[PDB]
């Protein structure tokens, strides 16, 4: 109702930064980002893995198939996979050996629901190694794979362009 | 008092942190173990860095009749 929320710097106290303006916390945006690992950890990291792997997947094509080293390819193995089924691989363990900055070793299974979560002190960590595996495992099958319905898709193309 | 409109539906209000969408499409355990080996992650990565990376580079560099540098 007011001048802009009940008028506030942060959630509350103004001695943390964030300076909650728009581009920070407008219900216009903060909702376009929470089926995913923004505010709350839906299911485990397991599945988010491939919507992450894949979406980021079929990117990196025209970038290295239309800006390729010697470009505009007449090789049936480009306009897609070619090599770049390398980036996802050079980075699908650029990750795993960051999940060695996570250990904390468990197995609860709580991607099923119980009592309206919070994950409470959900900030900080509170996602152990046996989590960050099933994500960067979802990443490989999202990366490699997400590279082929790029490639596999023929290419019916819009262009020029001026 | 007409423009005292008793806030034309309060809302409740604050929808919530409460509940403006259900969740994630039911597509899941349609990958259960499907693509395991990072879902048997129980000691690996050393395997995928000789394997994958000896076949992004073994045949990847070699070639039977150049098309040279």
């Amino acid at each position: 109702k007011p001048t802009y929320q009940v008028i506030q710097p942060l959630n509350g106290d103004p001695f943390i930064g964030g300076l909650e303006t728009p581009v920070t916390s407008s219900p216009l945006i903060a909702w376009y980002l929470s089926n995913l690992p923004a505010y709350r950890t839906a299911v485990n990291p397991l599945l988010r893995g491939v919507e992450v792997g894949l979406a980021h997947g079929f990117l990196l094509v025209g970038p290295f198939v239309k800006a390729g080293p010697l470009r505009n390819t007449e090789y049936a193995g480009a306009a897609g996979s070619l090599a770049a089924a390398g980036l996802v691989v050079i980075l699908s363990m650029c990750l795993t050996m960051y999940g060695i900055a996570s250990f904390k070793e468990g197995e609860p299974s709580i991607a099923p629901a119980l009592t309206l979560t919070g994950r409470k002190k959900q900030p900080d960590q509170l996602q152990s190694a046996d989590g960050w595996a099933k994500f960067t495992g979802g990443f490989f099958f999202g990366g490699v794979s997400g590279v082929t319905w790029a490639c596999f898709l023929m290419y019916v193309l819009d262009l020029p362009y001026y | 008092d007409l423009e005292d409109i008793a806030n034309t539906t309060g809302q409740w209000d604050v929808y919530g942190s409460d509940a403006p969408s259900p969740y994630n499409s039911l597509q899941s355990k349609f990958f259960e173990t499907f693509a395991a080996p990072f879902t048997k992650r129980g000691l690996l990565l050393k395997f995928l860095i000789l394997g994958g990376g000896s076949l992004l580079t073994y045949v990847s560099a070699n070639a039977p009749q150049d098309v040279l540098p």
Partner: peptide, 30 residues
């Protein structure tokens, strides 16, 4: 077979590095 001695620049200049930039991220942790 004909003309094929190209593996001792990736195994070194490329893959050997992979090992250590991975591996030696032992300086961070192991």
């Amino acid at each position: 077979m004909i003309n094929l001695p190209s593996l001792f620049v990736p195994l070194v200049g490329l893959l050997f590095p992979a090992v250590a930039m991975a591996s030696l991220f032992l300086h961070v942790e192991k």
